[PDB]
Design a protein around this ligand. Structure first.
Ligand SMILES: [Cl-]
Ligand SMILES: [Cl-]
Ligand SMILES: [Cl-]
Ligand SMILES: [Cl-]
Ligand SMILES: [Cl-]
Ligand SMILES: [Cl-]
Ligand SMILES: [Cl-]
Ligand SMILES: [Cl-]
Ligand SMILES: [K+]
Ligand SMILES: [Mg+2]
Ligand SMILES: [Mg+2]
Ligand SMILES: [Mg+2]
Ligand SMILES: [Mg+2]
Ligand SMILES: [Mg+2]
Ligand SMILES: [Mg+2]
Ligand SMILES: [Mg+2]
Ligand SMILES: [Mg+2]
Ligand SMILES: [Mg+2]
Ligand SMILES: [Mg+2]
Ligand SMILES: [Mg+2]
Ligand SMILES: [Mg+2]
Ligand SMILES: [Mg+2]
Ligand SMILES: [Mg+2]
Ligand SMILES: [Mg+2]
Ligand SMILES: [Mg+2]
Ligand SMILES: [Mg+2]
Ligand SMILES: [Mg+2]
Ligand SMILES: [Mg+2]
Ligand SMILES: [Mg+2]
Ligand SMILES: [Mg+2]
Ligand SMILES: [Mg+2]
Ligand code: NA
Ligand code: NA
Ligand code: NA
Ligand code: NA
Ligand code: NA
Ligand code: NA
Ligand code: NA
Ligand code: NA
Ligand code: NA
Ligand code: NA
Ligand code: NA
Ligand code: NA
Ligand code: NA
Ligand code: NA
Ligand code: NA
Ligand code: NA
Ligand code: NA
Ligand code: NA
Ligand code: NA
Ligand code: NA
Ligand code: NA
Ligand code: NA
Ligand code: NA
Ligand code: NA
Ligand code: NA
Ligand code: NA
Ligand SMILES: [Sr+2]
Ligand SMILES: [Sr+2]
Ligand SMILES: [Sr+2]
Ligand SMILES: [Sr+2]
Ligand SMILES: [Sr+2]
Ligand SMILES: [Sr+2]
Ligand SMILES: [Sr+2]
Ligand SMILES: [Sr+2]
Ligand SMILES: [Sr+2]
Ligand SMILES: [Sr+2]
Ligand SMILES: [Sr+2]
Ligand SMILES: [Sr+2]
Ligand SMILES: [Sr+2]
Ligand SMILES: [Sr+2]
Ligand SMILES: [Sr+2]
Ligand SMILES: [Sr+2]
Ligand SMILES: [Sr+2]
Ligand SMILES: [Sr+2]
Ligand SMILES: [Sr+2]
Ligand SMILES: [Sr+2]
Ligand SMILES: [Sr+2]
Ligand SMILES: [Sr+2]
Ligand SMILES: [Sr+2]
Ligand SMILES: [Sr+2]
Ligand SMILES: [Sr+2]
Ligand SMILES: [Sr+2]
Ligand SMILES: [Sr+2]
Lengths: 337, 142, 160, 172
RNA sequence: ACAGCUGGUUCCAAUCGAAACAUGUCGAAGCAUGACCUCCGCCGAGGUAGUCUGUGAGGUAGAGCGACCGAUUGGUCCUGUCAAACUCCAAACUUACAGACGCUGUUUGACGCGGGGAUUCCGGUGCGCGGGGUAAGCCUGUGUACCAGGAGGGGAACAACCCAGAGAUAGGUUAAGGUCCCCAAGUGUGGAUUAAGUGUAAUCCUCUGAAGGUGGUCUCGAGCCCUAGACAGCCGGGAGGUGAGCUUAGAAGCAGCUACCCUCUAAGAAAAGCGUAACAGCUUACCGGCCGAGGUUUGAGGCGCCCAAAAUGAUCGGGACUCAAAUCCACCACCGAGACCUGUCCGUACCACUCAUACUGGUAAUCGAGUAGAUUGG
RNA sequence: CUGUCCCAACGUUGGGCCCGGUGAACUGUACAUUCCAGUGCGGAGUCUGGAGACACCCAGGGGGAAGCAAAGACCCUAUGGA
RNA sequence: CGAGUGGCUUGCUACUUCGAUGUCGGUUCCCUCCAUCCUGCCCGUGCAGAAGCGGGCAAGGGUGAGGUUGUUCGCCUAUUAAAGGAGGUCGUGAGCUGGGUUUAGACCGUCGUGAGACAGGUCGGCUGCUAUCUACUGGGUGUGUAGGUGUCUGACAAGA
RNA sequence: CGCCACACGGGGUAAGAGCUGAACGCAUCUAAGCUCGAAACCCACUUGGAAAAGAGACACCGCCGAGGUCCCGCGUACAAG
């Protein structure tokens, strides 16, 4: 009767085309519960090493015992929240009302931007407050960006700009919290929003695979037995039935594989730090030597070394936070063995 | 944003279809019409079945596609479109010269067309275009 | 076989047994029920089962209803009870079935039916004013086993 | 057809559109009464339910409306009383009222506490082995009252044998 | 090479215009002879597509069968059923002849007769009547109109369904069908029903919906009860003789059996229905009370609901519509063909004049579509 | 015994892709951006109703054109052939 | 006994194609139906519990691996929550396979005087084509909206 | 063949359990009205998505210069582009 089988590959991440902005753009931000705060930070994937910890799980019998855990190194130097964007609530969702900027910019922000010369912060700010006064202020996000220049391993100086939502406090309170941050230089570190032990959401653009066949792309079988010698090996059975007299867009086909945005959930921040503590002997292969601001994110992270990864407090956490896990050992062992 | 509308119509408590029939009619006569407060418009019958029809109209589609509105905004617009030869020259012009809105983005109160109104004091089985929209999945932006 | 095959009158009259042979015997056991010794007029109440549509009722439906109908009257009024039902129709229409292909398609005798035009008494009971409500239930179960819908007309009885 | 309701001396009727609020020294019950061509209204002291129609469907609701108001009268004066008696066989069930929601613990020996939320003003008050739901809004009371009995609903085991549960005993 | 088989066979126009059936045929993918189409010549006053009456032919429907016939019930005459190959009856209708009327013919010569040329003998569909078959967009008859060979208007599309048969052009009025938008004309009138989006689907392979069921709602009638207070609900009482008798350790309204009787009274059963081992205890009849107006039983009609499960995307063409844009009963005003009316030209037929079939003048309500084919001018 | 399979991976060589040069053929009533249904000689890109659809170009695997290629070998028929 | 729905079996018809619409089984890949095997929520019980039996809502997901036979079917084994059924030209041969049917060779049984036959068995016995259109997977160039950079929105669409 | 991550919860119903409740003084889950209730529906989460013809929003820069192409060195990209 022909046994059952789930279709090959998932339909959720479609179409499987190359991404528009290599810089991830979250499409969902955390809820407003705590104090006013920015809802995410970003960095650059460095490489992988393992670490030994002390089991935090109060339920696991292993609780208290050492345990070897893999970790992706991500250099996360200080970013600069260069502006504050306001959204007005209109009959057609949210729309950018107005932004508030600064004076002190990063020496090389003009490599990507058309840096302001004459902005009227106080006035623009007024617009926001009058809109809040009217009861039309939606959510408050801060135009942000990185200092790629800070990271040596990364060749790019030309900064990666991305907006991030701010929440937590009451509209008014967080609004001010925003301005406060911005009304300086916008400098902030990962510890300004995270703490080791907290589960985050790392989003990134996958590794570049170019065009690939159905087998690799949609995980379809290869021709089997005798069927793999007649002149067909990685080609599928057919593109559909007689009728519908067409090719349904749900049949696994050759195409662009990789370079897609992915938002990898519940990534636990195993340790936030600064220095050369996670670096490897010889240097992180095809990256370099780490020294300074960073994060040790548990497990894999979407993307290749040098790619901009983005963090965010877990929108859908499953377990309870175990702040600051006891990190006994971090591997310095070479990655060329 | 600005729309120099000759006619402004208020759909509040008015039978969607009937109102549409006239708007498309006038539009076919060179009348730049504007429907207002459509979310408050209405269609008679068992909500349960009035919904199925619109909920089914969402399920329908394929590679070619069969887009169907959900916002009370849209529904009305497409309804009107179904009363005009929107494929033709004359029709595209007419249909394109008609716009529907959530609430009233204007100053002027919208006039009410004859026969198009309902009386809640005599009816109990009818539905807010917005209720339909809320059910379809739309986010109440009105 | 489904009554659908012989319920309508759309064949000539088929009865001349002097020409038709091998006709299956009637499944109908009795035509007179109750006390066939007593007279019809010896009863106050007289209710009939009127078929509302013109049909052909095979002896099997005839017997089957006649059966379950009388079996109620026997139940609710005793075997040797005071009553007397009657079935005034008889299966004359000989039925056949082409059981080759369409080549030489005249069928072979399979059964028998009783042509009944609408507005007719298939059955007719005779009882006392008290038994009538059973004599009616006896018919409800009767018309359930015959193709057409039916009436139950009290032809004698202004007692209620 | 037309029926009238002379509101009791304690009571204060008042209307706004379709909604009717009733006040007494026990409470206040606002209720919407809506039906095609049945118009309710206050005439000084009497409440008038009237309609030009006289069809069974129209008459059905006319009747229903009256009782809804008459009950509101009694609700705002004397109030509604539903009595319950918590019953347990082998497992000592604990029934208390946490904040605004009667709770039940260790039902049939469960670690998970079952709890319903209280409907409206309704007052759930426990006295050992008895519970007494009361209030002006029979709607909220009768419901909250039922809510409690239902909360101990069991379907996977023979109820004739497994009967632990709070039950309604007095209906007003 | 032969082929009864398939393919092809070249310019304009005007008049007429089929057969897809009969008989015979090694005949059924063909022919011949008829039917029928066409053309020519002849004859010379009748003709008969309709109707009415008259004189005849007839046994299908229907009916009936102590009128034949053969079927087919029961009972101590009575009682229950049938017929393509039955009939004591018996139509409608069909049909011979004749008269009348209508129509038609005697310069358009009918009717008829003789001769030349065909095509045709795969038909189909609607409706009526059929026979066969579970059925079929099935098979096979028949009458008829239509498709084929028939446009144009309507029906969403769509040979045969409705209107309609049609020279050109033009003005006008309708037909079928339609008037909320798409889309020309009514968001027309008086009224009632429907709450299912039933429905918005003449006919249909195509538009399903059935047996059974329905305190959904609407309308109509009939019997009975009732302010001497009905129907229902609440309260009240439901009393003794005696646990009826027997049965039996016991049976005491309430296992079975037979009776089913009289006191008190306003009621109250030899107990209708549960309850106990049996008593208990709980109701039903039955009476009273409170209350206060209609109530109960039954017959018929209307719309609806249920019965109701199929495969890429739901549907009345779509939109969408609910005192309707649904349904039914009536009404009003419109839209809408190439039809009907109307002006002009054209073709053909005939008449007058004429050598002409060249002009000119006239007649057509009773001329103007067409495949095969016949005829004919260019 | 083993990549036949579980269950696929990486690699090698020649193509495949871009560039110069050379340079055909199959096929073509017309129109043609299609899909969903319906309809129709009952298996429609083209009819009806809807939905969808800015043009052009590159690579792909071949769902559809009842794709192309052969006046069906199957079946019957012919007053055919061997 | 009576009333039906379906269009999966079979049968009937001969409308459709004979200037050709590739067979059965299988395989691979995508969509679907519900008359639901499992999973979720429910009703009944000859419902103590436990394990069941029957029924309702429900098509999200699942429904697997093997032994004989070309088999579809079916039989069998061991696992399982369960190892459900049907449609898509009995989905899918310009995808594959070619085991069966159904060429030309040959044997046996049967029938036949014989050639030879078989709605018997058996061994062997081939799988074309460079994609114009359209369709969907992905990748570009332009026009439109009307100078540039950066950041957004979210009608809509997909998911298990 | 290794390793990492892949909810709860909300909202509205079905079958079902009920509430107040009339036509029908009672009774009744329903006729109006209401509380609940499926792995199923919406939301939630991920993905795409200014060509959405109502063809969008905001900030800044610039119209004689903002910016872009070319070019050169190369990959986190890549069959051409
Ligand atoms: Cl394969
Ligand atoms: Cl779609
Ligand atoms: Cl159009
Ligand atoms: Cl209503
Ligand atoms: Cl004619
Ligand atoms: Cl609808
Ligand atoms: Cl000429
Ligand atoms: Cl196993
Ligand atoms: K063929
Ligand atoms: Mg290594
Ligand atoms: Mg190593
Ligand atoms: Mg159990
Ligand atoms: Mg000619
Ligand atoms: Mg001529
Ligand atoms: Mg007869
Ligand atoms: Mg012909
Ligand atoms: Mg109009
Ligand atoms: Mg319908
Ligand atoms: Mg041939
Ligand atoms: Mg042969
Ligand atoms: Mg020979
Ligand atoms: Mg083909
Ligand atoms: Mg089901
Ligand atoms: Mg499903
Ligand atoms: Mg074999
Ligand atoms: Mg197949
Ligand atoms: Mg294929
Ligand atoms: Mg092939
Ligand atoms: Mg073989
Ligand atoms: Mg040989
Ligand atoms: Mg090939
Ligand atoms: Na090959
Ligand atoms: Na095929
Ligand atoms: Na849709
Ligand atoms: Na034979
Ligand atoms: Na020959
Ligand atoms: Na021949
Ligand atoms: Na013939
Ligand atoms: Na012949
Ligand atoms: Na005459
Ligand atoms: Na007749
Ligand atoms: Na004709
Ligand atoms: Na037409
Ligand atoms: Na409908
Ligand atoms: Na409507
Ligand atoms: Na001709
Ligand atoms: Na290998
Ligand atoms: Na193809
Ligand atoms: Na030979
Ligand atoms: Na059927
Ligand atoms: Na196959
Ligand atoms: Na499922
Ligand atoms: Na097998
Ligand atoms: Na096929
Ligand atoms: Na095959
Ligand atoms: Na092949
Ligand atoms: Na739930
Ligand atoms: Sr974003
Ligand atoms: Sr988004
Ligand atoms: Sr091969
Ligand atoms: Sr097709
Ligand atoms: Sr017949
Ligand atoms: Sr019946
Ligand atoms: Sr003629
Ligand atoms: Sr005759
Ligand atoms: Sr109008
Ligand atoms: Sr009107
Ligand atoms: Sr009317
Ligand atoms: Sr059809
Ligand atoms: Sr019909
Ligand atoms: Sr019925
Ligand atoms: Sr179903
Ligand atoms: Sr002519
Ligand atoms: Sr002519
Ligand atoms: Sr290719
Ligand atoms: Sr189950
Ligand atoms: Sr088969
Ligand atoms: Sr077998
Ligand atoms: Sr299959
Ligand atoms: Sr073979
Ligand atoms: Sr053989
Ligand atoms: Sr243009
Ligand atoms: Sr319910
Ligand atoms: Sr744009």
């Amino acid at each position: 009767p022909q046994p059952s089988r789930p279709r090959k590959g998932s339909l959720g991440f479609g179409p499987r085309k190359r991404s528009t902005s290599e810089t991830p753009r979250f499409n969902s931000w955390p809820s407003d519960d705590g104090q006013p705060g920015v809802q995410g930070f970003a960095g650059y994937k460095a490489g992988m090493t393992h670490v030994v910890l002390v089991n935090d799980e109060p339920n696991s019998p292993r609780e208290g015992m050492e345990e070897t855990v893999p970790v992706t190194v991500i250099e996360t130097p200080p970013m600069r929240a260069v502006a504050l964007r306001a959204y007005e609530d209109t009959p057609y969702g949210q729309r950018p009302l107005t932004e508030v900027w600064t004076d002190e910019f990063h020496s090389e922000l003009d490599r990507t931007l058309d840096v302001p010369e004459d902005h009227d912060p106080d006035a623009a700010e007024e617009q926001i407050r009058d809109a809040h006064e009217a009861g039309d202020l939606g959510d408050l996000r801060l135009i942000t960006h990185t200092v790629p220049d800070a990271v040596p391993s990364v060749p790019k100086k030309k900064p990666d700009v991305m907006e991030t939502r701010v929440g937590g406090g009451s509209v008014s309170d967080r609004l001010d919290h925003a301005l406060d941050i911005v009304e300086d230089g916008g400098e902030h570190a990962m510890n300004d929003i995270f703490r080791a032990g907290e589960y985050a959401d790392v989003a990134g653009v996958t590794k570049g695979k170019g065009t690939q066949g159905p087998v690799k792309r949609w995980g379809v079988q290869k021709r089997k037995g005798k069927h793999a010698r007649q002149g067909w090996r990685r080609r599928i059975g057919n593109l559909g039935p007689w009728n519908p007299s067409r090719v349904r867009s749900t049949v696994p086909q050759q195409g662009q594989t990789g370079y897609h945005q992915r938002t990898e959930l519940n990534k636990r921040l195993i340790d936030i730090g600064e220095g050369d503590e996670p670096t490897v002997d010889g240097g992180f292969v095809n990256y370099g030597e780490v020294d300074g601001p960073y994060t040790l994110v548990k497990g894999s992270v979407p993307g290749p070394d040098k790619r901009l990864v983005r963090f965010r407090p877990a929108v859908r956490p499953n377990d309870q936070p175990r702040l600051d896990p006891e990190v006994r050992y971090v591997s310095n062992e070479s990655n060329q063995g | 944003a600005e729309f120099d509308a000759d006619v402004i119509v208020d759909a509040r408590d008015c039978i969607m279809g009937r109102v549409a029939s006239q708007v498309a009619e006038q539009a076919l006569d060179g009348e730049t019409v504007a429907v207002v407060n459509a979310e408050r418009a209405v269609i008679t019958g068992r909500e349960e079945q009035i919904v199925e029809k619109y909920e089914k109209r969402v399920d329908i589609g394929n590679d070619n596609g069969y887009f169907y509105p959900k916002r009370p905004d849209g529904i009305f617009k497409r309804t009107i479109r179904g009363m005009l030869p929107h494929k033709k020259q004359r029709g595209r012009e007419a249909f394109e010269s008609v716009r529907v809105y959530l609430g009233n983005p204007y100053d002027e109160d919208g006039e009410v067309l004859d026969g198009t109104s309902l009386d809640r004091l005599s009816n109990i089985k009818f539905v807010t275009l917005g209720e339909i929209s809320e059910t379809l999945g739309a986010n109440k932006t009105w | 076989k489904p009554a659908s095959m012989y319920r309508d009158i759309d064949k000539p009259a088929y009865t001349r047994r002097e020409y038709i042979t091998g006709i299956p015997g009637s499944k109908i056991a009795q035509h007179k029920m109750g006390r066939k010794q007593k007279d019809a007029d010896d009863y106050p109440v007289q209710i009939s089962l009127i078929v509302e549509e013109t049909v052909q009722l095979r002896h099997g439906s005839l017997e089957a209803s006649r059966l379950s109908a009388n079996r109620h009257l026997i139940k609710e009024l005793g075997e040797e009870g005071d009553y007397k039902m009657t079935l005034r129709k008889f299966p004359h229409q000989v039925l056949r079935e082409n059981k080759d292909g369409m080549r030489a398609a005249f069928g072979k005798i399979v059964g028998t039916a009783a042509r009944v035009q609408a507005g007719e008494q298939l059955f007719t009971a005779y009882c006392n004013v008290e038994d009538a409500e059973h004599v009616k239930e006896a018919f409800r179960r009767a018309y359930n086993k015959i193709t057409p819908s039916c009436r139950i007309k009290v032809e004698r009885g202004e007692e209620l | 057809p037309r029926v009238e309701l002379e509101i009791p001396e304690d009571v204060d009727a008042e209307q706004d559109h379709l909604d009717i609020t009733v006040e007494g020294d026990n409470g206040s019950v606002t209720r919407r009464l809506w039906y095609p061509d049945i118009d309710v209204s206050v005439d000084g002291d009497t409440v008038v339910i009237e309609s030009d129609e006289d069809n069974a469907k129209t008459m059905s609701t006319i009747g229903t409306f009256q009782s809804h108001i008459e009950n509101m009268f009694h609700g705002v004066t004397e109030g509604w009383e539903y009595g319950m008696e918590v019953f347990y066989s082998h497992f000592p069930m604990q029934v208390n009222v946490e904040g605004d929601e009667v709770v039940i613990e260790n039902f049939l020996g469960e670690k998970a506490p079952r709890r319903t939320t209280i409907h409206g003003d309704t007052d759930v008050e426990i006295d050992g082995e008895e519970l007494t739901v009361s209030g002006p809004d029979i709607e909220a009371v009768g419901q909250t009252a039922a809510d409690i009995e239902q909360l101990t609903r069991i379907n996977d085991k023979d109820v004739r044998v497994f009967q632990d549960g709070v039950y309604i005993t007095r209906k007003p």
